[PDB]
Every structure is written in C-alpha cells, then in structure tokens.
Amino acid sequence: FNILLATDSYKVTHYKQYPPNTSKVYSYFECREYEETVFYGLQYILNKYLKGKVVTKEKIQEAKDVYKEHFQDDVFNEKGWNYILEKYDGHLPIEIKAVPEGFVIPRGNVLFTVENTDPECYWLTNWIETILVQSWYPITVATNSREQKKILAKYLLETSGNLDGLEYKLHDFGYRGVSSQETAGIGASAHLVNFKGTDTVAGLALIKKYYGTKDPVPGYSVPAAEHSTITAWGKDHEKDAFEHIVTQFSSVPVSVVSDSYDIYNACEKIWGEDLRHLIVSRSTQAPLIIRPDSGNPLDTVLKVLEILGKKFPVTENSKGYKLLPPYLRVIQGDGVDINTLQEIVEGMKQKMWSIENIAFGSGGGLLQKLTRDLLNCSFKCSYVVTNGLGINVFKDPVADPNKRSKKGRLSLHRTPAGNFVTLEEGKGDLEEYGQDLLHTVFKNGKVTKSYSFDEIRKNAQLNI
Amino acid sequence: FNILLATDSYKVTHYKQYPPNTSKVYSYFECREYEETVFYGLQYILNKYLKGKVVTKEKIQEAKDVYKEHFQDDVFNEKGWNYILEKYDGHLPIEIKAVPEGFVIPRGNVLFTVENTDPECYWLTNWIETILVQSWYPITVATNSREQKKILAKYLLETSGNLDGLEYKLHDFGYRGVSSQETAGIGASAHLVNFKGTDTVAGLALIKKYYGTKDPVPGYSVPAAEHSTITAWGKDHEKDAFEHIVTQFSSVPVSVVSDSYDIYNACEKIWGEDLRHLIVSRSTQAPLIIRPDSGNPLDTVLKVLEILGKKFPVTENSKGYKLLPPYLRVIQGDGVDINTLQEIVEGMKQKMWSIENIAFGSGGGLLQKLTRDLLNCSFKCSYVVTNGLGINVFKDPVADPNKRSKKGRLSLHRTPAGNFVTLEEGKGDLEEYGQDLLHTVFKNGKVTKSYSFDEIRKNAQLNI
Numbered sequence: 001f002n003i004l005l006a007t008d009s010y011k012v013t014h015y016k017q018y019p020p021n022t023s024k025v026y027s028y029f030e031c032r033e034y035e036e037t038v039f040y041g042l043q044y045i046l047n048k049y050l051k052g053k054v055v056t057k058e059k060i061q062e063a064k065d066v067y068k069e070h071f072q073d074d075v076f077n078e079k080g081w082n083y084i085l086e087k088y089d090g091h092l093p094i095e096i097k098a099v100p101e102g103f104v105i106p107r108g109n110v111l112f113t114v115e116n117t118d119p120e121c122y123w124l125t126n127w128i129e130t131i132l133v134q135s136w137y138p139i140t141v142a143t144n145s146r147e148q149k150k151i152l153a154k155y156l157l158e159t160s161g162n163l164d165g166l167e168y169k170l171h172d173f174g175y176r177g178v179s180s181q182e183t184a185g186i187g188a189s190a191h192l193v194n195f196k197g198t199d200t201v202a203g204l205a206l207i208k209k210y211y212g213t214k215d216p217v218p219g220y221s222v223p224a225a226e227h228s229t230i231t232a233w234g235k236d237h238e239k240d241a242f243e244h245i246v247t248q249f250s251s252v253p254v255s256v257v258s259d260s261y262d263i264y265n266a267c268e269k270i271w272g273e274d275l276r277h278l279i280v281s282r283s284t285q286a287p288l289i290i291r292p293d294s295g296n297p298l299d300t301v302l303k304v305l306e307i308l309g310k311k312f313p314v315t316e317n318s319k320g321y322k323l324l325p326p327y328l329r330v331i332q333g334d335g336v337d338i339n340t341l342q343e344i345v346e347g348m349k350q351k352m353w354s355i356e357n358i359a360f361g362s363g364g365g366l367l368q369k370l371t372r373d374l375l376n377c378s379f380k381c382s383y384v385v386t387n388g389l390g391i392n393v394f395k396d397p398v399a400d401p402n403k404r405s406k407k408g409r410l411s412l413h414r415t416p417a418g419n420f421v422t423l424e425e426g427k428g429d430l431e432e433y434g435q436d437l438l439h440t441v442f443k444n445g446k447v448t449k450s451y452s453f454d455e456i457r458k459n460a461q462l463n464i
Numbered sequence: 465f466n467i468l469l470a471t472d473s474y475k476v477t478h479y480k481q482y483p484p485n486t487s488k489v490y491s492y493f494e495c496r497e498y499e500e501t502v503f504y505g506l507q508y509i510l511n512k513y514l515k516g517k518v519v520t521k522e523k524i525q526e527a528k529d530v531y532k533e534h535f536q537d538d539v540f541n542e543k544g545w546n547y548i549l550e551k552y553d554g555h556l557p558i559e560i561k562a563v564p565e566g567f568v569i570p571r572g573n574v575l576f577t578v579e580n581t582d583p584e585c586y587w588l589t590n591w592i593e594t595i596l597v598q599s600w601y602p603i604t605v606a607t608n609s610r611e612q613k614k615i616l617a618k619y620l621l622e623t624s625g626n627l628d629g630l631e632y633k634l635h636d637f638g639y640r641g642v643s644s645q646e647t648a649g650i651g652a653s654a655h656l657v658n659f660k661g662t663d664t665v666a667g668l669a670l671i672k673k674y675y676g677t678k679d680p681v682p683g684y685s686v687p688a689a690e691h692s693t694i695t696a697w698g699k700d701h702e703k704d705a706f707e708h709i710v711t712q713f714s715s716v717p718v719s720v721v722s723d724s725y726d727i728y729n730a731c732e733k734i735w736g737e738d739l740r741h742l743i744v745s746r747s748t749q750a751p752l753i754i755r756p757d758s759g760n761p762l763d764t765v766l767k768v769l770e771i772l773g774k775k776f777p778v779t780e781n782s783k784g785y786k787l788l789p790p791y792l793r794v795i796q797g798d799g800v801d802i803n804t805l806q807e808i809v810e811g812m813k814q815k816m817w818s819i820e821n822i823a824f825g826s827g828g829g830l831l832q833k834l835t836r837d838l839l840n841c842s843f844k845c846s847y848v849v850t851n852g853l854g855i856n857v858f859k860d861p862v863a864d865p866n867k868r869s870k871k872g873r874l875s876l877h878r879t880p881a882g883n884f885v886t887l888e889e890g891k892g893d894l895e896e897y898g899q900d901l902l903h904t905v906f907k908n909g910k911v912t913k914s915y916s917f918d919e920i921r922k923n924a925q926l927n928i
C-alpha cells in the first residue's frame with residue numbers, strides 16, 4: 001500500500017491551488033443533516049493506513065512515475081513528499097481529533113477534525129480526505145445495524161417482556177454480497193458492534209488486530225445447511241438429507257434450509273410428521289432452526305409459523321403471545337433489510353406470534369445496500385491560516401442549503417440538557433459549554449488514543 | 465490472508481452434510497434472469513486469493529483455534545485441509561472454467577463452473593463459493609458502466625454525428641464513496657473496461673498487476689479544483705481563486721468547481737465577464753471545464769449552458785445542435801447515476817445542446833450503489849457424483865421460480881443465429897452446438913489461461 005497513490009487524482013494537483021503562504025488547512029467530517037449515528041471505524045484506518053513510516057524513497061518514485069503518465073504532465077509534489085520523508089522520517093505531520101468510537105451522536109455534528117502540524121504540509125490535510133471519508137462505511141453499517149436492533153428490541157420486549165437473545169436476532173449473511181474481502185471484514189466488524197451472530201468470518205480477525213476483545217472471539221455461528229447440501233441428495237431424498245444433517249449436529253443448534261422444493265411441504269410433512277421424532281427430542285440449547293429462503297418474506301414467515309403451530313405443542317407466554325417449543329425456532333434470511341425486518345415483526349405481532357420464535361439473516365441489506373449518502377457523510381475545510389491570519393471558511397451553494405458547511409475551528413460539547421452541540425468559529429474557546437468532547441487520536445505519525453471493541457460496544461448500547 | 469478463514473461460517477460445517485460417498489461437487493455462477501453482462505474480475509480473484517500454496521500448517525492451526533471458539537464446538541475439517549497440504553503442497557485441487565473476460569453475455573447463462581479434481585475434496589468446491597461470488601462486484605460495475613456508455617454513445621452520435629471523446633465522458637469520482645481501499649481498486653478497474661477517465665487511482669495498480677496494458681497506464685485525469693481550494697481564498701475572493709487556478713494550469717485542461725457560493729453568478733459574472741479574457745485565450749487541447757456540483761442536476765446543467773451560451777460565442781454543428789467554443793466545456797459530477805445521466809443527455813437534446821458540451825463525474829452511482837441482486841448473481845451446485853453415479857441436481861423453490869437453478873453439467877455455446885445458449889444435463893457433449901465457450905482458467909493451484917486488460921476492453925466494446 002502506498003499512501004501517495006491512495007487519493008483522488010485531482011488532490012495531487014491541489015498544492016498548486018491554495019492561496020500563497022497558506023500554513024494551515026483544517027478540515028472536518030460530519031454526517032450532515034437515521035437521526036443519530038454510531039461513530040466507528042476510524043481506528044482501523046489510522047492503524048492500517050496512516051500511522052508510522054508511510055513515505056519512502058521507493059513510494060515517492062513509484063508515485064512520480066505513475067502520475068507522470070496519468071496526468072501526461074509533471075504535477076506531482078515530489079518536493080513536498082520528500083520534505084516529509086527527510087524531516088519526519090516519513091511520518092505524517094497531521095493531528096486528528098475525534099469523538100470516542102462507539103459514541104452515538106446526532107446528525108450534523110463534528111465527528112473528527114484534521115489539520116497539518118507543519119506549515120509546509122498545508123496540502124496534506126486534504127490529501128488524506130479520500131481515505132478518511134471511507135469511514136462513512138463502518139459508521140453506516142454500525143448505525144443501520146443498531147437501528148435494526150432498536151426495532152428488534154421494541155418487538156421482543158413487547159411480545160415477550162424481556163430482551164433475552166436480542167444479540168443473536170440479526171445474523172450477518174453478507175460475506176458473498178459485499179464488493180471485496182476488505183469490505184467484508186470492515187462491515188462485519190461494524191455489525192458486531194451491535195450483535196454477536198455472524199457468518200462473515202473476516203470480521204473476527206479485523207476486530208482482534210485493530211480493536212481487541214476480552215473474549216476469544218467477538219462473534220459466533222452455528223452449523224447450517226445450504227442448498228447444495230440438501231439438493232445433492234436428489235429431489236426425492238430431501239428427507240434423508242434433513243435426517244442426516246440434524247443427526248450429525250444433534251447436540252448443538254442447527255439451521256436447516258427447508259425451501260429447496262416446497263417449504264410448506266417440508267415444514268408440514270417432513271419436519272412435522274416424518275422426522276418429528278428427531279425434533280421433539282432435542283435440547284433447549286440445541287434447537288432445530290428451520291430456514292425458509294424464498295417467497296414473500298412476511299407471508300412466508302407467517303405461513304411457516306402457522307404450519308409449525310399445528311404440528312408442534314405451542315404455548316402462550318406471559319404476554320399472551322404464541323411460542324413454539326424450545327427445541328424449534330425459525331430464521332428468515334431471504335430479502336431482509338431494515339424495512340422488511342420491520343414488516344415481519346409487526347406482522348408477527350399482529351398474528352400474536354412472539355418475536356422469541358424468530359431470528360433473521362441479512363447479507364446485502366446489512367453490508368452492501370448502503371452508500372455514503374444515507375447519512376450524508378462528507379469532509380470539508382472550515383479554517384485556514386494564510387499570511388499568518390486565520391480565516392473561517394465554508395461553502396454554501398445557492399441551490400442546496402444541504403451542502404452548506406460549518407465555519408472555523410470546531411468543537412463538540414454537551415448542552416445544559418446533556419444533548420450535543422457543535423460550536424463553530426472557535427467559540428468552544430469561550431468555555432461556556434465546558435470541555436471539547438473530541439480527543440486527539442493521531443498526531444505526527446502516532447496513534448495517541450485508542451478504544452477496545454468492548455468499550456465501543458458499551459458506548460453503542462441502546463438506552464433499554 | 466488465510467483461505468480457511470475466507471468462507472461463510474456455515475460452509476465450515478458442510479463437509480458433514482453432503483451425501484456419504486460423494487466424490488464430486490460441481491457448481492456454476494450465473495447472473496440469473498440489464499439484459500447482458502460484462503464478465504470481468506475473476507482473474508483478479510484467482511491470482512490474489514486462490515493460486516499457489518494457500519494452505520500451511522500454521523493456517524490450519526489458526527482456523528482450528530478460531531473455529532473452536534466461533535462455533536463453541538470442534539466442527540472444523542482439519543483432516544480434509546491437511547490432506548490438501550500433504551498431497552498437493554497446499555495447492556487447491558479445483559478446476560474452474562470461465563467465459564473469456566470482457567465477453568458480453570445475456571442474463572441466465574453459465575459464466576463459470578467450479579469442481580473438485582480429487583474425490584477427497586468434494587467439500588472444497590463450495591467452500592470457495594463465498595470468495596468467487598464476490599465476482600458479482602466487478603461484473604456489475606463493468607456492466608453498469610457499459611450501459612451508461614451506450615446512453616452516452618446514442619446521444620453523442622445523434623447530436624454530433626460521431627463518437628469522438630466518448631471514452632472520457634464518464635469520469636470515476638467514487639474513491640471516497642466506496643466501502644474500502646480494496647473495493648476502490650476493483651471497482652475503478654471495472655469502470656476502465658469501458659472508459660479512460662478516472663480519479664480513483666487505486667484502479668491503475670490493480671490493472672498493472674493482474675491484467676496488464678500495452679499503454680503505460682489504463683486511465684487518466686486532469687487537474688481539477690475542489691471546494692477547499694476555492695473556499696480557502698475567502699468568500700470575497702472566489703475570482704482570485706479561479707484566476708490563480710486557471711493560470712497555474714494554463715496549458716492543460718482544468719476543471720474548476722464553480723458552485724461554492726452561487727454557480728449562476730460564477731458562470732455569468734466571474735467566468736463570463738471578469739475572467740472571460742483568460743478563457744477565450746485557451747487552447748482546444750486545454751479547455752476550462754466549468755464544474756457545477758449542486759442543485760437539481762438537469763435544471764442546473766441546462767441553466768449553466770444557457771448562461772454560458774449568452775456570454776460565449778456558440779456555433780451550430782452540422783446536426784443542428786449548439787456547441788460552446790472549444791476552449792470551454794462543462795462537467796456535471798453531482799447526483800450522477802445511470803438514471804440521472806439519461807435524464808440530463810435527453811434534456812440537453814431537447815434544448816438543442818450537443819452532448820459534445822458535457823461530461824460527467826460519478827462516484828457512489830458508479831462504484832457503490834450496486835448490489836449482488838442487480839444482476840441476480842448466484843452460485844449453485846448442479847451436478848454431483850455419489851457412489852460413482854452422476855446425478856443432476858438443482859433447487860426449485862415453490863414460491864419463487866426465479867430462484868430455480870440449472871441441472872447437470874453445463875456448457876456455453878453460440879446459437880446458429882449468433883446468440884448464446886447454456887446447455888444443461890451434459891448435452892454439450894452431443895456437439896450439436898459448436899464448441900464450449902468456457903475455458904479452463906484455473907486447475908490444481910495454477911492459473912491456466914489469462915487475459916490482458918487490452919483484450920478485455922476489446923471483448924467489451926459496444927456494437928455501433
């Protein structure tokens with residue numbers, strides 16, 4: 001990896017465009033006005049890409065040669081990058097201040113700020129915009145995952161009276177549905193801020209290396225079938241497949257995809273009659289988890305539950321909702337996103353089925369069908385010093401007040417009512433709102449403040 | 465990177481679920497029934513992740529330790545992975561056959577197949593489903609980018625009579641808007657199959673390393689301002705910023721973002737009056753490219769063109785469409801996706817403006833706002849050998865015929881009319897349809913057939 005080649009091309013040309021005698025460029029990231037966002041993922045970027053000796057003679061030469069062809073011209077700031085190599089042993093003279101990871105902050109607040117610590121390196125602040133702005137992704141995954149946790153918590157509490165099992169109710173199925181291995185690890189880690197169930201194994205190593213947990217692993221899975229392991233037996237032998245699988249995994253939970261040919265026949269006849277003896281004998285710690293995977297998600301879940309309710313001994317819990325026996329559960333992992341998850345739990349509640357009975361899997365909805373524009377994430381210069389004079393700067397496009405940016409040096413504060421406010425124009429310096437909540441997390445090539453994954457999870461808890 | 469940790473967790477458990485006495489599992493990828501897809505990106509995955517010694521004693525131990533905690537149980541196929549290590553020096557006994565990269569194939573056709581070449585490794589075929597299915601991403605980017613190229617070609621031809629400059633009409637702005645550095649390189653390389661202009665520098669090294677071009681670089685950029693380089697001058701000094709910037713880049717094309725405060729004022733008064741003398745003196749090879757970046761994209765483009773056409777001499781080309789002088793062009797890089805791109809070129813055509821006048825930048829629309837479901841990309845087992853007998857297998861869920869998969873051994877053929885057909889059930893063996901278009905690209909740890917990026921671009925060309 002070469003940081004000289006990890007920016008938007010145009011930024012290679014910007015050192016020639018700032019006002020002469022500019023000594024400081026100061027910029028900030030916000031999720032510009034999903035009312036609150038989980039701040040998560042900057043620490044991964046600081047450690048993997050920004051800290052330590054990130055400039056060498058070889059990387060400068062590599063970049064020089066690439067840009068000469070890419071621009072068909074010499075624009076590359078060879079001298080400026082060489083200055084960093086010679087003066088600072090290739091450590092970036094940058095200071096980044098940030099809200100603690102895991103913090104849940106309303107939209108429109110400063111989340112981190114970036115500025116150069118050497119006047120010669122005024123151009124460096126925005127060089128690294130591109131790489132820092134990618135923090136949008138773990139923020140957005142963590143935020144959207146937490147929003148689904150809120151929905152699940154509301155309905156689980158209402159239909160059952162407690163939150164038991166909540167952290168296992170939304171399982172990450174998105175490894176194949178993301179755009180890369182690196183994205184899989186980042187997104188899966190962001191989901192694990194809120195939940196514990198994951199099939200996206202890449203998330204584990206990332207958390208272990210960059211954040212750390214008291215537990216050996218931050219997430220867990222269970223054995224589960226896929227269509228190849230059912231259909232390989234042949235269409236006439238779906239029962240033999242089911243029997244073999246539950247018997248191989250007789251003492252741990254096992255998920256078995258049941259819709260290869262006819263989900264309703266599988267539930268009613270195969271599970272509900274032919275193999276019923278192998279289900280009712282299972283432990284509470286080792287249920288069969290039936291997995292439909294096609295059809296209208298709500299309609300399918302309701303009909304599956306109706307079928308099972310007729311074949312197995314249903315109880316009524318203390319809230320008056322129906323509950324399958326403890327050895328039998330359902331997981332819906334097709335077509336799941338925040339919208340359909342809401343539709344399913346509401347439809348279940350309306351038909352008097354406890355949310356205890358169900359869990360969800362989600363792949364693309366969880367890790368891929370998200371963009372930087374969902375929380376309007378963006379990074380802008382708000383302050384410059386030119387000719388020794390500090391100036392508060394901003395953009396304010398006539399036709400889109402939504403793209404208006406903040407002015408001057410920024411700080412994040414608690415209000416007297418304990419909400420958040422971002423103070424502009426250096427007004428934090430007046431101290432009418434107590435101390436700035438941002439902390440220096442990176443300075444001159446070093447990570448200066450860090451959070452464990454356990455701390456992040458605590459910061460990210462729901463109010464309930 | 466450890467390929468034992470690069471699968472969906474449940475696949476770790478599948479070796480215990482297939483029918484006993486299974487010696488072969490054979491699987492295929494399709495973009496299940498955007499009528500045609502550009503096949504691109506597999507060669508990256510083969511080289512980066514699948515080839516050579518990918519199993520070691522250490523990687524086996526690491527996976528074993530991780531999975532023991534992840535599953536709270538010892539389900540991991542240590543023996544099976546050890547067998548590959550000892551027998552094949554850690555090289556995967558897998559054969560993959562694929563349509564050539566760059567090929568443009570209608571939906572619902574086999575694009576590649578995967579099978580194990582050693583009966584002991586029947587479980588391996590689908591172990592690597594997760595990593596191979598990520599090919600959805602470069603396929604989908606390449607395909608969506610090419611569809612935008614078709615729109616641009618149609619309107620450019622209609623309004624100008626030719627396709628000159630077509631390959632520079634859609635510029636990749638997506639580096640900050642994708643989910644990771646790795647995704648940035650993959651996505652950017654896929655866009656470069658169709659176009660030559662990019663700010664996502666990461667795409668260049670990926671192409672150079674995995675594909676190769678005769679040209680020094682596969683993509684190019686031009687100097688361009690951003691809001692920090694304009695706003696840093698202070699609000700009252702926008703004209704000074706513009707002047708400094710066009711003067712710094714007087715002999716190459718230069719893009720200058722013009723909407724920091726009031727795009728219409730900037731066009732009519734700053735460029736069109738105060739600095740007009742610095743614009744009309746510019747070369748045809750070094751135009752000013754004015755960049756709006758806010759507002760309704762269609763309304764804004766049209767109003768900018770109207771303003772400019774009143775301040776600069778406009779000609780009428782041989783097709784009857786209005787053309788700005790050659791030293792002046794516009795780039796619209798906000799809110800651009802395939803739908804808004806079509807709306808803008810159509811709106812322009814209606815107001816009699818040549819598409820020669822305009823180019824586009826697109827970030828999230830081009831590289832992030834895409835999912836595996838756009839082309840319905842899926843990987844399924846279609847054939848297995850159990851007890852020495854081959855059986856054709858498939859899923860066919862009752863409530864969604866769209867998830868029905870193909871049966872048996874597959875092959876891809878030209879039809880007598882020159883179209884494509886996927887033959888099922890090993891019917892390609894009858895040779896009634898000319899030769900199979902799938903070629904072995906990977907076998908037993910070796911990449912056996914490779915394509916240059918130049919060949920891919922040729923394969924992916926538009927008809928016209």
Ligand SMILES: NC(=O)c1ccc[n+]([C@@H]2O[C@H](COP(=O)(O)O)[C@@H](O)[C@H]2O)c1
Binds near residue numbers: 177291472
């Ligand atoms: N453990 C599992 O059951 C498991 C794991 C990974 C993916 N999947 C598949 O993921 C699909 C959902 O993916 P999307 O949410 O990306 O559409 C489901 O159809 C499911 O079959 C299932």
Ligand SMILES: NC(=O)c1ccc[n+]([C@@H]2O[C@H](COP(=O)(O)O)[C@@H](O)[C@H]2O)c1
Binds near residue numbers: 010636637797800
């Ligand atoms: N060379 C350039 O002009 C350039 C490069 C990269 C990103 N951008 C910015 O990208 C934004 C578009 O990004 P999205 O398409 O992801 O929304 C534009 O508003 C533009 O300012 C511009």
Ligand code: BEF
Binds near residue numbers: 859
């Ligand atoms: F494994 Be099935 F095709 F979702």
Ligand code: BEF
Binds near residue numbers: 689690691692757
């Ligand atoms: F650089 Be601008 F804020 F698009």
Ligand SMILES: [Mg+2]
Binds near residue numbers: 293
């Ligand atoms: Mg599925």
Ligand SMILES: [Mg+2]
Binds near residue numbers: 757
């Ligand atoms: Mg912009």
Ligand SMILES: [Mg+2]
Binds near residue numbers: 378
């Ligand atoms: Mg934007």
Ligand SMILES: [Mg+2]
Binds near residue numbers: 842
């Ligand atoms: Mg699917």
